[PDB]
Amino acid sequence: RPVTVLGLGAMGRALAGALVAAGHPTTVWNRTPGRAAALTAAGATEAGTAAEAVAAGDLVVVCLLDDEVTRQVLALVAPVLAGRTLVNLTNGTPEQARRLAEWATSHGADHLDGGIMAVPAMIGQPGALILYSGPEDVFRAGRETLAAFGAAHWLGADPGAAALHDLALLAAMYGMFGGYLHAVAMIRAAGVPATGFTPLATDWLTAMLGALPALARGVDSGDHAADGSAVGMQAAAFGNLLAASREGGVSTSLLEPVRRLLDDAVRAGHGADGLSALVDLLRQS
C-alpha cells in the first residue's frame, strides 16, 4: 500500500522513516518546510499540501501536536478522505478517538486510533509497541503497514480502546516511577547510591507485580478479600514512611494522595479489606 504521513515532528519523522526503510511508497507533509530532507533523500516524497499528501495514500497516518491541530488539518482534507483508512497516531483521549471515527465515517473513510507506547528512536524496532483500536477488518487490511512501526496490538472494535489502554498504562507507569523516584530521594538523602539500590527495588517490585491478579479479581468480583495485607495496617504503616521522608528533608508530595486514599478507605469501613476496595473510591460520577 502507498502510505501518507501528516506531521513531521520527532515522532512523525520516525514514523515516516520506518515506512521508508521498510520499502513502503511514502508521501509526507508538514506545515513548516525543511523537515523532510533526510526522508526525501531516503526515497520519500514531500507533498506541498496536506490534501496532496492525502490523495497519494490509501492509508493516512497522522501524528500532529494534539487533537485540536489534528481536527483542523483533517477538516481541510475532508473532501479527499473517501475510500482511505485514517490512522491517528496523535495522542488523545478515548472520546476524541470515538468522535473522529464518526467524523471520518461521515466523509467515506475508515478509521483506526493508535497510541504509541515507544520513543521515536525505538520506532521500527520489533520491541516498539503501538496499540490500535477500531474495526477488525480495517486493522487487518492495514496491519502489515503498521508492522513497519513495530508491534501492532489490536485491542478491539471500540475506537476509543487504544487511547484508554494507552493512558491507563501511562498512569501505572507514572505511579511506579513516582514511587521509585521518591525512594531514591530517601536513600540519596542518607548518602546511599541509587545504583546499588536498584536490584533490591527491582526484585521487590517484581514480587509486587504478582499481587496484581488477586487485586483485579477483587475489583471485578466486588469481593475485596485481603491477602493479609489489609488497608488498615497499610494505613497505619504509611506514617513511618512520611516521618522518615521528613527526617531526610524529602518532600512527601508524591505520597500524600495514597495516604489520604487509605485513610478514606478506613473511614469508609474497608480497614479489613484488600486494596481492591480502593478502586471504587476513586469514582466521582
Ligand X SMILES: NC(=O)c1ccc[n+]([C@@H]2O[C@H](COP(=O)([O-])OP(=O)(O)OC[C@H]3O[C@@H](n4cnc5c(N)ncnc54)[C@H](OP(=O)(O)O)[C@@H]3O)[C@@H](O)[C@H]2O)c1
Nearest by Cα to 159 from 98, 102, 91 = 98
For residue 77, give the C-alpha cell: 482534507
Stretch that binds ligand X, among 58-66, 98-106, 133-141, 144-152 (CB under 6 A): 58-66
- Among a second copy, ligand X, none, the one that 232 touches (CB under a kind-dependent 5 to 8 A) is none
Judge whether 30 is annotated as a binding position: yes
Query: Taking CB under 6 A as the rule, does residue 233 contact ligand X?
Result: yes
Query: Taking CB under 6 A as the rule, does residue 8 contact ligand X?
Result: yes
Judge whether 240 is annotated as a binding position: no
Q: Read off φ and ψ for residue 106, nearest 5 degrees.
A: -65, -20
CB 128 within 8 A of CB 122: yes
Query: Taking CB under 6 A as the rule, does residue 64 contact ligand X?
Result: yes
Integer CA distances (angstroms), 277 to 45, 209, 222, 236, in order: 55, 18, 8, 17
Query: What angle, 0 to 180 degrees and rounded to 10, lies between the N-to-C axes of helices 67-77 and 94-106?
Result: 0
- Among ligand X, a second copy, none, the one that 103 touches (CB under a kind-dependent 5 to 8 A) is none
| Residue 87 CB neighbours (<10 A) | 28
Query: Taking CB under 6 A as the rule, does residue 123 contact ligand X?
Result: no
- Among ligand X, a second copy, none, the one that 216 touches (CB under a kind-dependent 5 to 8 A) is a second copy
Q: Which of 38, 119, 209, 212 binds ligand X (CB under 6 A)?
A: 119
Nearest by Cα to 97 from 115, 116, 109, 81 = 115
In terms of CB distance, is 17 or 57 closer to a second copy? 17
Which segments are annotated as binding site for NADP(+)?
A: 8-11, 30-32, 64-65, 72, 91
Residues in contact with ligand X by the rule CB under 6 A: 7-12, 30-32, 35, 63-65, 69, 73, 90-91, 116, 119-120, 229, 233, 237
